[PDB]
């Protein structure tokens, strides 16, 4: 099991309170109590940021819920505070999640006086953590499976949301890690991995070989498309392209392997052999191009066991004609997976610190 996850973007500390407190004492002549509490709620928000984006990596629902709360909050402050009028005086500075920058200098960083920029990088890190937690799961466990599937789908919908909104909200030119191309590709990757998780669920629940094959076939479409978005690009870490190329072939081999079990059941012995030969070729390709990144050895043995047994009996008993691949029906596609929409609130039991404002 080799899953892709995304590193969180780094940020630097900001005093959210100082510039927010000072811009609350406006309309609101109440230099007394009520108005001067909405200014300690802005202390809670500044502390919340330090919590969401400042603490050393924690990989629990603990740390993700913090992040998602922080995102929820930032979004409900945008009507409260003048920022695409701006107006207020906050600068958020974030490093690019991927571009190391030249060691002939420093990071690739981008400072902007924008709530838009802030929420985008926050959402990014919500997606990235979600992907880390999904990739962490023990997939030999039904609840591990379920947490991976839920989180890959969240991460997919949240990268996609950034794709539709980064440019609108930034005004300026985004950094390449959050730009629509990188992030549309990360969305498709998480969604591929979500599908792969359903394939593994079905494997585990020993479902109908026909079901499993369509689930694997659709995964191969998703992984196919993601590697093709990466073919001419060097934005993501270097392990990403070869993993996606490998998975695209592994997924196709799983499709053919399970479709072969169905053919056999149906006494279509020639078709079984044809599909198994396709599987073995795919898996032979991956074993020789991509061995630094996946271990395909037990699958390969399993295919070779089935193909050796298949050929021996067809030659000695059935004499079925082994058909050509272009003459076989296509394996269908079952998609069980979508990009979770970002609809605030995204956090568990949210309350806006500035609700009655």
């Amino acid at each position: 099991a080799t899953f892709i996850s995304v590193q969180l973007k780094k940020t630097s500390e900001v005093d959210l309170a100082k510039p927010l407190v000072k811009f609350i004492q406006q309309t609101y002549p109440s230099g007394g109590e009520e108005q001067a509490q909405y200014c300690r709620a802005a202390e809670e928000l500044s502390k919340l940021r330090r919590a969401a984006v400042g603490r050393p990596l924690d990989k629990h629902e603990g740390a993700l819920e913090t992040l998602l709360r922080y995102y929820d909050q930032i979004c409900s402050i945008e009507p409260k505070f003048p920022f695409s009028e701006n107006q207020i005086c906050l600068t958020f500075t974030w490093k690019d999640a991927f571009d190391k920058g030249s060691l002939f200098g420093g990071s690739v960083k981008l400072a902007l006086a924008s709530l838009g920029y802030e929420k985008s990088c926050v959402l990014f890190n919500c997606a990235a953590l979600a992907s880390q937690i999904a990739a962490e799961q023990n997939l030999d466990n039904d609840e591990g499976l379920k947490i991976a599937a839920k989180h890959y789908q969240f991460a997919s919908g949240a990268f996609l949301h950034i794709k539709e909104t980064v440019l609108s909200a930034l005004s300026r030119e985004p950094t390449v890690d959050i730009s629509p191309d990188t992030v549309g590709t990360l969305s498709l990757i998480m969604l591929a991995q979500a599908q792969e998780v359903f394939f593994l669920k079905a494997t585990r629940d020993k479902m109908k070989d026909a079901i499993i094959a369509k689930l694997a076939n659709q995964a191969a479409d998703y992984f196919g498309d993601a590697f093709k978005q990466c073919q001419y690009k060097d934005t993501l870490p270097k392990e990403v392209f070869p993993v996606l190329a490998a998975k695209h072939c592994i997924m196709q081999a799983n499709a053919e392997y399970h479709q072969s079990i169905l053919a056999k059941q149906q006494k279509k012995f020639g078709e079984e052999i044809a599909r198994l030969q396709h599987a073995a070729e795919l898996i032979k390709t991956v074993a020789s191009r991509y061995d630094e990144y996946v271990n395909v050895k037990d699958f390969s043995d399993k295919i070779n066991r089935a193909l050796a047994a298949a050929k021996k009996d067809n030659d000695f008993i059935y004499h079925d004609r082994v058909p050509d691949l272009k003459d076989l029906d296509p394996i269908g596609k079952a998609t069980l997976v979508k990009s979770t929409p970002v609809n605030v609130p995204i956090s568990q039991k949210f309350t806006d610190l500035f609700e009655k404002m």
């Binding site: 839920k150 789908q153 359903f198 479902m207 109908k208 026909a210």
Partner: peptide
């Protein structure tokens, strides 16, 4: 065959 498919869709729910 989309019967066992709904009973997969509604697991992650």
């Amino acid at each position: 065959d989309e019967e066992a498919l709904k009973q997969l869709a509604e697991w992650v729910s």
